[PDB]
Amino acid sequence: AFETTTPPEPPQFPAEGKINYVARDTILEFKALPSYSEPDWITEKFEKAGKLPPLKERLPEEPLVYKTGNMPDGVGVYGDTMRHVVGGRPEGWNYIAGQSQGWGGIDIALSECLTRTAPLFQVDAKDTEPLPNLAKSWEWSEDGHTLTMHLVKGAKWSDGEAFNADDVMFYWEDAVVDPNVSPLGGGASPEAFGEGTTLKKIDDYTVEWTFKAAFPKQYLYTMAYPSFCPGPSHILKPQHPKYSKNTYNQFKNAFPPEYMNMPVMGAWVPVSYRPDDLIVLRRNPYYWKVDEKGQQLPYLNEVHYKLSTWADRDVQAVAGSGDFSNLEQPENFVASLKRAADPNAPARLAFGPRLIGYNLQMNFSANGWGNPDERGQAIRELNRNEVFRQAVTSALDRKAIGDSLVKGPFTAIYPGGISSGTSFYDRASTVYYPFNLEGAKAALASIGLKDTDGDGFLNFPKETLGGRNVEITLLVNNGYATDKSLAEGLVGQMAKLGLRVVIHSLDSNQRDAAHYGGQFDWLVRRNSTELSSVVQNTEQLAPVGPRTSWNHRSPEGKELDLMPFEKEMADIVRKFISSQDNAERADLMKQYQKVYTQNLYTIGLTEYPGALIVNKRFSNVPQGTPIFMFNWAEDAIIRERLWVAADKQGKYELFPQQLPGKPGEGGPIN
Ligand SMILES: OC[C@H]1O[C@H](O[C@@H]2[C@@H](O)[C@H](O)[C@@H](O)[C@H](O)[C@@H]2O)[C@H](O)[C@@H](O)[C@H]1O
Ligand SMILES: [Ca+2]
Ligand SMILES: [Cl-]
Ligand SMILES: [Cl-]
Ligand SMILES: [Cl-]
Ligand SMILES: [Cl-]
Ligand SMILES: [Cl-]
Ligand SMILES: [Cl-]
Ligand SMILES: [Cl-]
Numbered sequence: 001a002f003e004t005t006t007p008p009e010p011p012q013f014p015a016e017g018k019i020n021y022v023a024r025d026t027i028l029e030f031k032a033l034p035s036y037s038e039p040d041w042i043t044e045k046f047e048k049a050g051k052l053p054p055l056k057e058r059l060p061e062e063p064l065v066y067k068t069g070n071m072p073d074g075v076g077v078y079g080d081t082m083r084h085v086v087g088g089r090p091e092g093w094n095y096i097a098g099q100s101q102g103w104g105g106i107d108i109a110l111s112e113c114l115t116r117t118a119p120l121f122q123v124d125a126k127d128t129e130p131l132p133n134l135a136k137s138w139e140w141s142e143d144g145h146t147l148t149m150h151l152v153k154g155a156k157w158s159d160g161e162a163f164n165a166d167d168v169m170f171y172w173e174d175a176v177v178d179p180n181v182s183p184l185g186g187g188a189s190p191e192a193f194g195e196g197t198t199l200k201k202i203d204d205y206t207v208e209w210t211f212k213a214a215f216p217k218q219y220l221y222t223m224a225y226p227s228f229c230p231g232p233s234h235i236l237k238p239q240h241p242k243y244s245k246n247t248y249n250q251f252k253n254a255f256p257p258e259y260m261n262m263p264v265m266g267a268w269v270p271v272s273y274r275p276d277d278l279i280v281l282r283r284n285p286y287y288w289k290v291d292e293k294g295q296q297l298p299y300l301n302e303v304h305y306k307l308s309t310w311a312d313r314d315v316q317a318v319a320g321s322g323d324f325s326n327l328e329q330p331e332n333f334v335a336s337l338k339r340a341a342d343p344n345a346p347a348r349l350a351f352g353p354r355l356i357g358y359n360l361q362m363n364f365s366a367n368g369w370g371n372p373d374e375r376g377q378a379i380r381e382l383n384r385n386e387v388f389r390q391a392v393t394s395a396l397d398r399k400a401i402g403d404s405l406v407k408g409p410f411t412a413i414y415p416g417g418i419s420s421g422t423s424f425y426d427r428a429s430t431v432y433y434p435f436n437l438e439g440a441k442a443a444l445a446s447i448g449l450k451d452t453d454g455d456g457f458l459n460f461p462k463e464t465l466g467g468r469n470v471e472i473t474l475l476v477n478n479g480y481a482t483d484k485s486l487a488e489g490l491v492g493q494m495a496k497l498g499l500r501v502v503i504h505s506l507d508s509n510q511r512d513a514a515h516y517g518g519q520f521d522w523l524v525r526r527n528s529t530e531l532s533s534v535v536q537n538t539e540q541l542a543p544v545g546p547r548t549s550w551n552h553r554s555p556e557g558k559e560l561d562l563m564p565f566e567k568e569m570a571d572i573v574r575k576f577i578s579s580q581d582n583a584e585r586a587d588l589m590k591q592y593q594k595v596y597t598q599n600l601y602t603i604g605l606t607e608y609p610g611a612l613i614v615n616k617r618f619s620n621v622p623q624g625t626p627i628f629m630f631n632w633a634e635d636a637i638i639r640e641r642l643w644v645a646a647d648k649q650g651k652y653e654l655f656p657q658q659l660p661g662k663p664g665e666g667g668p669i670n
Contacts, residue, residue: 004432006431007430013410017350017352017625019121020072023123024120024129030137033063036290036295037294042285046669059154059296063152064132064290066297067292071291073619076299080653082324083304083321083322084313085322086307087104087308087479088100090257092254094231095107096171098184099184100512102279104305111184111225112265115224116133117221121624126424126582127582130224134163135150135223144215146210147211149208149209151206152205152288157264157286159232159286159663160286166204167231167233168230174240179556181251183226185225187540189546191544192540193219214578218538219577235263258273261661261665261666263663266287267287267298268298271655271660272655280305281303284298291641302653304652310479311481313326314327314613318346319346320346324614324615324634326610330482332481336613346616351611352624353422355609355629356527356607356608356609357526357532357605357607359527361603362522364552365518366380366381369518369553369558370518370519374465379473384563386599386600393415394439395436395496396605398435401486405606417602422533422534426590426593431594431598441497449461455469457470471500471501472499473520474490474504474521475522475523476505476511476524477524479508488503534589538573539573541573546559551601568595569596572591573592576592622636657670
């Protein structure tokens, strides 16, 4: 019906900062060092005062040692604070039960995972193994169905309680496997680690995975952020409904933001909170990572999370009151670039590849995900019709969408699928539906949609909903100008097509509950890592499991009503996950891209590059760090390895020479 092509080449972006590519094992290693050191005030005011055990005792036998060769500026010195500004608000501290801490790096900093992938932007190979993190090493069996995972041994939580396999097993069994619990990020279902995957304890520092497929090495990426980040079981397990009289809601809400010094495996601990103002994190004295000189990390003693807006993060970073920003809203690009143009600017700004994409996602579940009424179900059936999706995508003037956010070389024509900024992208495999409004109007008439009341808007046939006008709800995040602008644009464009679209503008936490719960027709969404990197959370590319897809989930317990193209997509993703051949993998992502964009798994809105804004006083910030690839730049820059020269240090500490207090007390100890 439509004359498809490939998307036109965008204006050549000279992608600012260049990456110094290194091999995978240049960053870190696990080993015992002859001696260890820490800030002098800890030894003098805490150890010598009998307030804290000596350093060698608080550390594991073989801590994670950062190698100096990879450090952009070398070994650091202690002091200073990294100041962050966020548009999110904390729900509480129960990350594994799906509670958000406010985003913008806070949960990234608090929740350490089995593996780590965000610093992999600097490693050149599409067959790279994720970095060891809480899992120090792992071995595959000869058949490739068994994965033996060795954990960091002798490490402790920020409260001094031992970290071991029991924390890993409580997360797997009582957060992932438990159907009533949904960990933060919305992708921690058991099938995300493969359908039929089991995990068992061997001993206190050894776990064993059993997979149906042979060598599905891609699941090591799923073991990174956000899907495998264990919580303190000694604190969380007594609150869990299986071991208490608590409901699942009571367990999820057992640790509100006012609960202080929540145990973490991260570099800093939350010590202070003031509603709609600030969150203060203080150095974790039990942190299990050190530099080559034996200095216990982090170098920075404090971290601030100012509770403001996402736009204000860009404002404060160029002004110098904030130290970091991911410039990701095109409406803020010109104002930020003008301010960064000054040689006296306190921060540096660098654009990366086009890895920020937006998609229109349609709910594909006709089996009752989100318990829809007669109207909702009729929309599910329209969404599932290929001709309907072809009309919606063809009715979008993508050049006008791009220009509505920012004029210039930033935006690129984005039909949907894999981001043009990743190596796995193939332009020739991307199906582009050019702007054809008349063809789109004709396509809808061809499936029995016509204006029966004379208002120009199309009606359902007499048999469906009494022949009333078609009305579609559109779920949006109200925290961003970009999301709102795209939602408003979609309403106006669909009105030209004869479709009435109604905005459902919700805050981040309400938006997540409506999305993951299936209570939506359509939704405007910024892409996650699977479309910007392919290799990070590959299971989210298709409905490989009942809850792995963002737009096609099944309610527990009903089976997935997959359309043939979705099953073809699920087979390609499964093949790629278990593929050991680089040429085969590249080819599978070409097939995937073709199936996705021809059948319109989602509908692309726009794609553009983001910019990393970092305060100039910070040392060890890697050159060319993207804002978003394997994860957000807050993770990619390795914040525990950042330092400031003594003569350049700011005096921003709110709890100087203080350490975190006890969980549920009492603020910092002093
Ligand atoms: O976590 C680090 C990021 O936090 C923010 O994104 C959040 C926010 O959009 C939530 O509402 C979503 O639920 C979540 O998925 C998403 O990552 C920043 O915009 C981004 O630049 C980066 O700092
Ligand atoms: Ca009508
Ligand atoms: Cl080295
Ligand atoms: Cl909120
Ligand atoms: Cl708010
Ligand atoms: Cl319950
Ligand atoms: Cl607090
Ligand atoms: Cl708040
Ligand atoms: Cl970037």
